[PDB]
Amino acid sequence: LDGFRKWYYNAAGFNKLGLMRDDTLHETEDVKEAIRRLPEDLYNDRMFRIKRALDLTMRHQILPKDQWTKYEEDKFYLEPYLKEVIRERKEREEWAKK
Amino acid sequence: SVPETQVSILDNGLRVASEQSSHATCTVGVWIDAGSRYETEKNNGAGYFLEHLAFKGTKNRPGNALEKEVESIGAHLNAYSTREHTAYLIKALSKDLPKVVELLADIVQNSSLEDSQIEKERDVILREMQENDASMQNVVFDYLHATAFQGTPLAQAVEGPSENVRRLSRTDLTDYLNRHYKAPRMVLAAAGGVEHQQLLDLAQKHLSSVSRVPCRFTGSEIRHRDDALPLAHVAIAVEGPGWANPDNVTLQVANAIIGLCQSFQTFNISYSDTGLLGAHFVCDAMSIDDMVFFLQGQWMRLCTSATESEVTRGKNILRNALVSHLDGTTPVCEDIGRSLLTYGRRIPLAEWESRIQEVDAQMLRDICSKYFYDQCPAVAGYGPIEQLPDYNRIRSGMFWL
Amino acid sequence: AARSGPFAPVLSATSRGVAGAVPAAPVLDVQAAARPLVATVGLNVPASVRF
Amino acid sequence: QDLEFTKLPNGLVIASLENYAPLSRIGLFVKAGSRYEDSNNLGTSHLLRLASSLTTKGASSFKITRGIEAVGGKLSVTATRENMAYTVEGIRSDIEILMEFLLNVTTAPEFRRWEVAALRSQLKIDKAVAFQNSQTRIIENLHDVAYKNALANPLYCPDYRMGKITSEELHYFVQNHFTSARMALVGLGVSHSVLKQVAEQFLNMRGGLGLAGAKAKYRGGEIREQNGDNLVHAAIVAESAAIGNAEANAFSVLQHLLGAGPHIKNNTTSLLSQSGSHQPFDVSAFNASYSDSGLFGIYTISQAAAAGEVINAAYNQVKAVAQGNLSSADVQAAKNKLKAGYLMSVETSEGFLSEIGSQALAAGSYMPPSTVLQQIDSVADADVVKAAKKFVSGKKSMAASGNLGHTPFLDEL
């Protein structure tokens, strides 16, 4: 399962643009709240990575293979911050339900 | 376990009410059923100007020697006037209970209005009014009262128009004093470390001399546009039920549900079988209309769809707030004086709790539909109020399609 | 002048008249005295000054 | 019965009184005022005071707000230069979760960075609302010119420090001053046992004595700020006694002799107020005593033009009291005013809870209202005179604001 997940990570292809996994999340309301709660350095790296991926998609290029994002290396930075947004979101929802 | 408020009555009709408690300081006050509602537009500032003159000396205690006495025991002397009630209250120690009562007796009868003082208090009152305009929310609530009770004695303010203030004389005052200070319309209320029998004996000794002898809600709006002010104050109200109508309690729970504008306050002002129930908010010009829309939706919501839980919230909120027992002596008595003047009796907190717990969501939305839905409001705006909607838009926001 | 030394532009001000930039250099709803300050704030009750 | 005060072995004071009130109040008192900051973390106590509804380790923000408003209870924070007090009140059937919320807020905050970044704008708004009146600004200026290090720190955050207060500063302040030896948990309308039992779930984390605060040093100085207000709010104070010293009382009797504000809703209510008078002006005596130092002086509001001699007249009156020119009936009336003010301050429930709280942190003991009465009586005429001479001689500190073209200076005063 670990090797097949690495193969699927190579087949997804966002590592060839230098992106992380959390860069590829669709910005819903909860995702934008989690992005707003990021520290300044992580937010700046995320915006630069997104801008570089957009430039590479503009020129129809990819990064060199040494510059790709290694599956093992990818960091799920937004995840911790996101869970909270969802948790808080649900708590609020439940309160209203009841 | 809250001690009951015991009420006695002298021949004069002055109900002497007291509610003893451990606290060693007491708040002894006199309430009088006399306000701007009893004035007839020729003496529109008589109660206010008498409230200024009442501490400037009596016949027995001429001038500042009187207030020297209330400095000597370290007591605090306060007075206020509303559209329906006037109160003169003293916070003191328990052991100074007799002299305080005697002091209050002078303040209600045997009072002396010095002509010299009359000019000095006229300049005080005139000037304060000349600067009172500064307080916007007071201007907005006076405008709301005027446009809601057009043509009635409830439109006119407590202070009165500068005109009357300048044009007032001892005899006029004497009249208001001799007319609206009757013994059956007076309550001697005491709260805190007082004994009821001692207070009754003191009321028999002094104060036993006091002589024994509708409104129409015009739904409309007043707007004072002045664009130089930084913030806008808007009050919207409908007709209230009055003091004696129990659904007030339910309406209070509704206010506790409401509790977008920088400041949003709900009010239920009650007078004798009338009142103003509504909301006052103070906002920047470019937000005003949105506030109004917000506010009307809430009201409409309660009238349209209100859950069980929020009701519980209001019930509880009101409960804690309604809690006044041992909140403060000044409050405690204030409640005794108003309860004997309005209800004719002191409603205990257990009866308030029973009337709160009988309120559910169905009767709350029924009473809110009775008092808010499809009613013509009174609107009073002051400040940059151009984006404040006119009467058709507010009236259309008073119901849902 | 002579007294200026290196503090002239500090003891003197010169408007350009006719011949870093300024870095972009509110309103709240509105006596007694001498009771030491004790500021209070609350979750529900609005904050206040007890001057 | 009466209050009960067990001292726990980790230093926490527990005080309880069960009077079977329908609404019961529970407060927690910490020696963590603004005097414990230095020049590197100014305004941290203001953000800590405004950060009482932030997601705590135990409870999320939504709950800490919706749960207190669900039962209709109240959570408030009152802060002086020495002490902070977090108070909750509500129906007896909901004070268990009210103590859960309050003790979570006191003991285990999280101080998330996005929450404090949202709170700094509220900090600016709260400071503007607080400085909407002239007294607050002139007392803050008076403390800043009167003291050097400790009590000179403002209650409200400075303008440059907004945007600069971090989560780490709040965490450091809490970890260095919210320890059990500086805390008293006081409950009116509750059983002592539960307070003892709610003192174990929390208030057990930090058992230290906290990072003690520097000794406050007097500096003197007069600051005048032209602000335009027609009224020149001027406060002239000097160093006075600490809370505990007997001299303290003497200074309280001295302010009630000189005038402590009006007692009527406005004349001949003060030796000061009496000292000629043909204009609108307010004059009172100011006294603020903290556990190491005190400030006593005069406070004047007046028309700019007369601002001078009015201040001089007030000063001259105190000099008369420094020369023994007083009567025993005046001192007896001052004692009666002071004791009536104390009894009316403790007659309310929240004032009673604050008093017990303060006494706890200050002396660890409860002083029955009665005891105080006889101690105030202890103050005698000469004692009052003595405190006066202290003010009349000690270096003064002056904070002035308004149109100060005719406001005198300290070397002229």
SS3 letters across D273-309: HHCCCCCCCEEEEEEEECCCCEEEEEEEECECCCHHH
| Interface touch B68/D268, C-beta < 8 Å | yes
Contact call for residues D78 and C39 (beta carbons, < 8 A):
yes
Q: What number of helices (H) and strands (E) belong to chain D?
A: 14, 11
The strands making up C39-42's β-sheet, listed across from edge to edge, are C39-42, D74-79, D84-91, D23-30, D183-188, D13-17, D4-7
Closest Cα partner for D379 from D316, D336, D345, D322? D336
| Interface touch C47/D126, C-beta < 8 Å | yes
Q: Which residues contact A32 (CB under 8 A, 6 or more apart)?
A: none
| Interface touch C41/D49, C-beta < 8 Å | yes
Name chain C contacts of B263, Cβ cutoff 8 Å: 29
| Interface touch C36/D80, C-beta < 8 Å | yes
Reported resolution, Å: 3.6
Closest Cα partner for A43 from A61, A22, A69, A62? A22
Name chain D contacts of C38, Cβ cutoff 8 Å: 78-80
B196 SS3 class:
helix
> In sequence order, what are the beta bridge partners of B379?
B221, B236
D350 → chain B, closest CA residue:
B327
Closest Cα partner for D64 from B263, B313, C44? C44
Closest Cα partner for D298 from D278, D319, D279, D280? D319
CA distance, residue B76 to nearest chain D CA (Å): 5
Contact call for residues D103 and D28 (beta carbons, < 8 A):
yes
- For chains B and D, count residue pairs whose Cβ atoms are closer than 8 Å: 94
Q: Are strands B263-271 and D4-7 parallel, antiparallel or unpaired?
A: unpaired
Polymer length of chain C: 51
Q: Report the distance separating Cα B29 and Cα B207, nearest Å.
A: 12
Phi, psi of B224 (to 5 degrees): -105, 90
Choosing from B39, B51, B84, B159, which is the catalytic residue? B51
Contact call for residues D400 and D225 (beta carbons, < 8 A):
yes
D357 is written with which tokens? 């709280």
Task: Write down the H helix ranges in D9-110.
Answer: 44-50, 61-70, 95-107
Q: Report the distance separating Cα A6 and Cα D52, nearest Å.
A: 47
Q: Which residues contact D360 (CB under 8 A, 6 or more apart)?
A: D5, D13, D15, D29, D184, D186, D366
Name chain C contacts of B135, Cβ cutoff 8 Å: 30
Chains that touch D (3 or more CB pairs under 8 A): A, B, C
CA D215 to centroid of chain Cα atoms: 18
Measured CA distances, D384 to D256, D311, D320, D322 (Å): 10, 21, 12, 9
Contact call for residues D248 and D296 (beta carbons, < 8 A):
no
Interior/surface letters B94-123, b for 16+ CB within 10 angstroms, e for the rest: bebbebbbbbbbbbbbebbbeeebbeebbe
Q: Report the distance separating Cα D309 and Cα D6, nearest Å.
A: 54
Three-class secondary structure assignment of chain A: CHHHHHHHHHHHCCCCCCCCCHHHCCCCHHHHHHHHCCCHHHHHHHHHHHHHHHHHHHCCCCCCHHHCCCCCCCCCCHHHHHHHHHHHHHHHHHHHHC
A95 is written with which tokens? 């309160």
What is the rounded (10 degree) CA torsion for B52, B55, B58, B63?
-110
Q: Do chains A and C touch (3 or more CB pairs under 8 A)?
A: no
Name chain D contacts of A43, Cβ cutoff 8 Å: none
Q: Report the distance separating Cα D209 and Cα D207, nearest Å.
A: 7
Q: Which amino acid is at B262?
A: Q
B51 annotated active-site: yes
D263 → chain C, closest CA residue:
C32
Q: Report the distance separating Cα D266 and Cα D273, nearest Å.
A: 9
D332 is written with which tokens? 């007896």
Contact call for residues D202 and D106 (beta carbons, < 8 A):
yes
Contact call for residues B277 and B238 (beta carbons, < 8 A):
yes
Contact call for residues D17 and D1 (beta carbons, < 8 A):
yes
Q: Which residues contact D108 (CB under 8 A, 6 or more apart)?
A: D56, D57, D58, D202, D205
CA distance, residue C27 to nearest chain B CA (Å): 7
Chains that touch C (3 or more CB pairs under 8 A): B, D
| Interface touch A88/D62, C-beta < 8 Å | yes
- H or E, element range at D4: strand D4-7
Measured CA distances, D223 to C33, D235, D236 (Å): 18, 10, 10
- H or E, element range at D223: strand D221-225
Interior/surface letters B259-282, b for 16+ CB within 10 angstroms, e for the rest: eebbebebbbbbbbebbbbbbbbb
Name chain B contacts of C27, Cβ cutoff 8 Å: 230-231, 284
> In sequence order, what are the beta bridge partners of B187?
B15, B31
B203 is written with which tokens? 């009321």
Interior/surface letters D313-341, b for 16+ CB within 10 angstroms, e for the rest: bbbebbeebbeeebeeebbebbbbbbbbb
Contacts of B2-5 spanning 24+ positions with Cβ under 8 A: B2/B325, B2/B348, B2/B349, B2/B350, B2/D22, B4/B346, B4/B348, B5/B336, B5/B339, B5/B346, B5/B348
Q: Which amino acid is at D324?
A: G
Best of D54, D55, D57, D60 to substitute, by most chain A Cβ atoms within 10 angstroms, is: D60
B227 is written with which tokens? 């664009």
Q: Does C31 touch chain D (CB under 8 A)?
A: yes
Name chain C contacts of D357, Cβ cutoff 8 Å: none
Contact call for residues A73 and A6 (beta carbons, < 8 A):
no
Q: Does D63 touch chain A (CB under 8 A)?
A: yes
Nearest to B320 among D73, D339, D344 (CB): D73
Q: Which residues contact B304 (CB under 8 A, 6 or more apart)?
A: B365, B400
Name chain D contacts of B72, Cβ cutoff 8 Å: 333, 336
Contact call for residues B69 and D268 (beta carbons, < 8 A):
no
Measured CA distances, D341 to D115, D256, D258, D334 (Å): 41, 10, 15, 10
CA distance, residue D55 to nearest chain A CA (Å): 10
| Interface touch C36/D155, C-beta < 8 Å | no
Q: Report the distance separating Cα B146 and Cα B41, nearest Å.
A: 13
- H or E, element range at B225: strand B221-225
B230 is written with which tokens? 């930084």
Q: Are strands B186-192 and B25-32 parallel, antiparallel or unpaired?
A: antiparallel
Q: Report the distance separating Cα B71 and Cα D262, nearest Å.
A: 9
Which of the 8 DSSP states describes residue D133? Answer: S
Contact call for residues D189 and D25 (beta carbons, < 8 A):
yes
B27 → chain D, closest CA residue:
D344
Q: Report the distance separating Cα D294 and Cα D243, nearest Å.
A: 7
- H or E, element range at C41: strand C39-42
Nearest to D62 among A36, A39, A95 (CB): A95
Nearest to B91 among D20, D72, D344 (CB): D344
- H or E, element range at D7: strand D4-7
| Interface touch A36/D66, C-beta < 8 Å | no
CA distance, residue B366 to nearest chain C CA (Å): 28
Q: Report the distance separating Cα D307 and Cα D403, nearest Å.
A: 9
B23 → chain D, closest CA residue:
D347
Q: Which amino acid is at D403?
A: N
Closest Cα partner for B378 from B241, B226, B216, B232? B216
Contact call for residues B156 and B43 (beta carbons, < 8 A):
no
Q: Are strands D13-17 and D23-30 parallel, antiparallel or unpaired?
A: unpaired
D81 → chain C, closest CA residue:
C38
Q: Report the distance separating Cα D64 and Cα D67, nearest Å.
A: 6
Contact call for residues B234 and B380 (beta carbons, < 8 A):
yes
DSSP for D42-67 reads TTHHHHHHHTTTSPBSSS-HHHHHHH
Contact call for residues B263 and B270 (beta carbons, < 8 A):
no
In the block, tokens 């041992």 appear at B326
Closest Cα partner for B169 from B62, B86, B53? B53
Q: Does C47 touch chain D (CB under 8 A)?
A: yes
CA distance, residue C23 to nearest chain D CA (Å): 15
Contact call for residues B260 and B287 (beta carbons, < 8 A):
yes
Contact call for residues B207 and B35 (beta carbons, < 8 A):
no
Q: Report the distance separating Cα D374 and Cα D368, nearest Å.
A: 11
D290 → chain C, closest CA residue:
C36
B120 is written with which tokens? 């000095």
Phi, psi of D158 (to 5 degrees): -70, 160
Phi, psi of D184 (to 5 degrees): -130, 130
CA B41 to centroid of chain Cα atoms: 20
| Interface touch C37/D75, C-beta < 8 Å | no
Measured CA distances, B357 to B245, B304, B346 (Å): 17, 22, 19
Q: Report the distance separating Cα A31 and Cα D233, nearest Å.
A: 53
Phi, psi of B266 (to 5 degrees): -100, 145
Q: Report the distance separating Cα D63 and Cα A73, nearest Å.
A: 37
Q: Which residues contact A58 (CB under 8 A, 6 or more apart)?
A: none
Q: Does A91 touch chain D (CB under 8 A)?
A: yes
B351 SS3 class:
helix
C44 → chain B, closest CA residue:
B259
| Interface touch D65/C43, C-beta < 8 Å | yes
Best of D56, D62, D110, D111 to substitute, by most chain A Cβ atoms within 10 angstroms, is: D62
Q: Is the dihedral of CA B82, B15, B349, B2 positive or negative?
A: positive
Q: Are strands B274-283 and B232-239 parallel, antiparallel or unpaired?
A: antiparallel
Q: Are strands B86-93 and B76-81 parallel, antiparallel or unpaired?
A: antiparallel
CA distance, residue D98 to nearest chain A CA (Å): 18
Interior/surface letters D194-215, b for 16+ CB within 10 angstroms, e for the rest: bbbebbeebbeebeeebeebee
Q: Do chains A and D touch (3 or more CB pairs under 8 A)?
A: yes
| Interface touch D75/C47, C-beta < 8 Å | no
